[PDB]
Paper text:
Substitutions of His109 in [name] with Ser, Gly, Ala, Gln, Cys and Lys showed the loss of its covalent complex formation with DNA but gained canonical UDG activities. The DNA backbone could not be modelled into the experimental electron density map in any of the mutant structures that were determined. The structures also revealed invariant interactions of N91 and H178 with uracil. It suggested that the initial increase in UDG activity (H109K to H109Q to [name]) occurred because of the efficiency with which the water molecule could be localized to make a nucleophilic attack on the C1′ position. Interestingly, G109 the smallest amino acid substitution of H109 showed lower cavity volume than Ser, Cys or Ala due to an overall structural change near the active site.
However, [name] is unique in possessing a flexible R-loop (105KRRIH109).
Residue numbers in the entry: 2 to 207
């Protein structure tokens, strides 16, 4: 059941966000500061789904406000997408993290399939409320939530996909997680930014 009994019967994003603040669908609400719901409105045509809020998002109350969000904005700017058409959210709404003794920043830990399934009711409520025409799936965790734990982003990135079990049959475009463009060789990162831009353009023209 997970978060099912915490999701209210409303398509109002402010009421959904307030309700996600009391959610006990899985254990992640305990160590996290607050629930991080999605930003943007119901007029949005493009829904973007990341994995989970990070350290800044957990204290800011908004998705993608740290370094990966800065990189995503640079790629949206280059793909000619304004955020006025964007509902931006994550698969899990509570920061899963550990503290590295002698490190800078709380380090994010990969949500389990159990926690992604527990949180999925909020993503179904968001998609039912926004009725997007295209869902951009940022990374493996988000793509698996809608396409199955077998899905590989590396084998299908930039492809317009359509699965029947998803609300409203929106077009789906799976791409690299923006944090991947902050790690590695300068040319792998430049090719990967160029692929995120291409994947965002495919989604913008659906
Ligand atoms: O909102 C955010 C921030 C960082 N990484 C994500 O997956 N989502
Ligand atoms: S991560 Fe999702 S399911 Fe788990 S407590 Fe937070 S809102 Fe509820």
């Amino acid at each position: 059941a997970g978060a099912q009994d915490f999701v209210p019967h409303t398509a109002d994003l402010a009421e959904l966000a307030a309700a996600a603040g009391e959610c006990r669908g899985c254990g992640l609400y305990r160590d996290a500061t607050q629930a991080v719901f999605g930003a943007g409105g119901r007029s949005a045509r493009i829904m973007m789904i990341g994995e989970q809020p990070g350290d800044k998002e957990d204290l800011a109350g908004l998705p993608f406000v740290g370094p990966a969000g800065r990189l995503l904005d640079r790629a949206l700017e280059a793909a000619d997408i304004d955020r006025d058409a964007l509902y931006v959210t994550n698969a899990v709404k509570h920061f899963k993290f550990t503290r590295a003794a002698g490190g800078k920043r709380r380090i994010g830990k990969t949500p389990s399939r159990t926690e992604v399934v527990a949180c999925r009711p909020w993503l179904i409520a968001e998609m039912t409320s926004v009725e997007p025409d295209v869902v951009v799936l940022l990374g493996a965790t988000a793509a698996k939530a809608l396409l199955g734990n077998d899905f590989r982003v590396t084998q299908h990135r930039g492809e317009v996909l359509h699965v029947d079990d998803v609300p409203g049959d929106p077009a789906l475009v799976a791409t690299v997680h923006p944090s991947s463009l902050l790690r590695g060789p300068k040319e792998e990162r430049e090719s990967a930014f160029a692929g995120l831009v291409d994947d965002l353009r495919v989604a913008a023209d659906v």
